UniProtKB/Swiss-Prot annotation, chain B:
The modification (Microbial infection) ADP-ribosylthreonine is found at T66. It comes from Homo sapiens. Changing K48R: No effect on HLTF-mediated polyubiquitination of PCNA. This is Ubiquitin. Exists either covalently attached to another protein, or free (unanchored). When covalently bound, it is conjugated to target proteins via an isopeptide bond either as a monomer (monoubiquitin), a polymer linked via different Lys residues of the ubiquitin (polyubiquitin chains) or a linear polymer linked via the initiator Met of the ubiquitin (linear polyubiquitin chains). The chain holds residues 1 to 75 of 229 of the full protein. Changing R72K: No effect on ADP-ribosylation. The lineage of its organism: Eukaryota, Metazoa, Chordata, Craniata, Vertebrata. The modification Phosphoserine is found at S65. Changing S65E: Phosphomimetic mutant that binds and activates PRKN.
Length: 233, 75
């Protein structure tokens, strides 16, 4: 029952635990619900922000009831579940792109992406239509190398057609590039190396500002190291 | 069989694996060659994140396939 009502394994074990320790102070900013920066929770803030920018749902009605409570202020349960699923200890930093990939199988697919595979001089070509909540591809219009073709030339994987909304997680280090080279998206998570810690933050393309914790700081997409983007059409 | 793994710098190393091997075994071979602990490793194939508990045959990883390595960020 517990595993069918909420849609994930060991659901009975989780729901008996105490979620109060993860009730971070939160506010509403530009309609989005964001978390105040504390206990290195920035990876949780930017992870749940992309779920809001993507307008994603969860497959089971039980998990969505948890996610809906997160957006209304009851952030204790879902935040704990992100630590419980990803296997991260409270107060410790984590990877937001790793969290989104583990969340993908629980999210209803709300979009589509065509990934074209071609080489340096069009020697071998193929197209496929991906329909997943999170797809690991290049956040740039360039693409990434993906091995050799039967002619000894490197493949290139780029997103050419976008339907609906999906989260494209970059396959590599945080990339800085001109804004007009990224895929057309609505929000970009950036990752700054402060010197061995890091700071996660989201860039709202509409307002042209940046979600930083519970505030709204200025930012420039041209100098932001993007790690994943909520691509839309 | 042999597979290729694109690393952090852009160079491509080759691994000697079996279709019955698990992803944790592939991460152990990357640690044994690049010195990166599997706790900092993320393997992507065909745009999908590879689970630790599954085998290469579960992801239909054929002979001479290419995986992408990306370091886990600490935010
Ligand atoms: Zn029920
Ligand atoms: Zn070719
Ligand atoms: Zn083509």
């Amino acid at each position: 029952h517990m595993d069918s009502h909420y849609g994930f394994d060991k659901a009975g074990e989780f729901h008996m635990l105490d979620h109060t320790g993860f009730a971070f102070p939160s506010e509403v900013v530009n309609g989005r619900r964001v978390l105040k920066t504390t206990d290195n929770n920035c990876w949780v803030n930017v992870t749940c922000l992309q779920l809001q920018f993507a307008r994603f749902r969860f497959k089971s009605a039980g998990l969505q009831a948890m996610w809906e409570s997160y957006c209304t202020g009851d952030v204790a349960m879902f935040v704990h579940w992100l630590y419980w699923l990803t296997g991260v200890d409270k107060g410790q930093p984590s990877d937001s792109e790793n969290a989104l990939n583990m969340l993908s199988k629980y999210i209803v697919p709300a979009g589509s992406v065509t990934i074209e595979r071609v080489t340096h001089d069009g020697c071998c070509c193929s197209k496929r239509v991906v329909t997943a909540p999170v797809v690991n591809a290049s956040v740039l219009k360039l693409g990434v190398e993906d091995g050799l073709c039967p002619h000894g030339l490197n493949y290139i994987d780029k997103v050419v057609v976008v339907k609906g909304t999906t989260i494209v997680v970059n396959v590599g280090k945080p990339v800085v590039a001109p804004s007009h080279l990224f895929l057309k998206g609505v929000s970009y998570t950036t990752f700054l190396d402060n010197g061995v810690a890091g700071h996660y933050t989201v860039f709202d393309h509409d307002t042209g500002m940046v979600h930083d914790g519970d505030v709204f700081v200025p930012g420039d997409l041209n100098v932001s190291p993007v790690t994943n983007v909520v691509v839309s059409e | 069989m042999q597979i290729f793994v694109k690393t952090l710098t852009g160079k491509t190393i080759t691994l000697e694996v079996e279709p019955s091997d698990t992803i944790e075994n592939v991460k152990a071979k990357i640690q044994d060659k690049e010195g990166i602990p599997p706790d900092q490793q993320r393997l992507i194939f065909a745009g999908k994140q590879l689970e630790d508990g599954r085998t290469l045959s579960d992801y239909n990883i054929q002979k001479e396939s290419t995986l992408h390595l990306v370091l886990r960020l600490r935010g």
